[PDB]
């Protein structure tokens, strides 16, 4: 019969066969269920969509039509939840968030 | 050669969310690394979670629990809701 992928019949875009393959041959457990790849693909897709939307917002805020590591840095550090999740990472070529202490400004 | 990427899937999600933008190569590599890192975090937490309960099977229950343990605040809630939606749609279909 004609074959349709688990990604399609699950509604997602991220791959489910690849996730299942990694979970199996990743020495995570002896035997792997049949809904875990779907759940993991859904979660990864959600996180990717969230950060990408914030990055696109920043990119258009700077009048540009291509997301760059600077915009990734800016979105991640301006959203507090993603900032906590990615608190310990350092996006390469991301620069720093603009900030000058109030005391340092002139009178 | 033949190195797996996630790049095409990231671009698919991008063209879904903002269907007029693009991604530079460095940004795409950064995003791929982010996906791999979060994947290995979730998988490791699920592995330890199954090992703690004398259980020898990764399944959606501890995938969900690992998601809830790692993602903070509203992220956990939204991700859990979306994961349950996807898995129920998959089993139904």
């Amino acid at each position: 019969a004609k074959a349709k992928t688990r990604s399609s019949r699950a509604g997602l875009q991220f791959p489910v066969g690849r996730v299942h393959r990694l979970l199996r041959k990743g020495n995570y457990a002896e035997r792997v269920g049949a809904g875990a790849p779907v759940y993991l693909a859904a979660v990864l897709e959600y996180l990717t969509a969230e950060i990408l939307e914030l990055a696109g917002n920043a990119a258009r805020d700077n009048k540009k039509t291509r997301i760059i590591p600077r915009h990734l840095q800016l979105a991640v550090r301006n959203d507090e939840e993603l900032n906590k999740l990615l608190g310990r990472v350092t996006i390469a070529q991301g620069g720093v968030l603009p900030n000058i202490q109030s005391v340092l400004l002139p009178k | 050669t033949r190195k797996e990427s996630y790049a095409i899937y990231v671009y698919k999600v991008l063209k879904q969310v903002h269907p007029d933008t693009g991604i530079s190569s460095k940004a795409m590599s950064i995003m791929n690394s982010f996906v791999n890192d979060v994947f290995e975090r979730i998988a490791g937490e699920a592995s330890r979670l199954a090992h703690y309960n004398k259980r020898s099977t990764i399944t959606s229950r501890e995938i969900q629990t690992a998601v809830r343990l790692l993602l903070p605040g509203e992220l956990a809630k939204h991700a859990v809701s979306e994961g349950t939606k996807a898995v129920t749609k998959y089993t139904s279909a």
Binding site: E53, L54, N57, D61, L74, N78, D79 | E74, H78, S81
Partner: peptide
Amino acid sequence: LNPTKRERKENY
């Protein structure tokens, strides 16, 4: 409860 569309950021 179908959580949707959380506290999206404002400017940049």
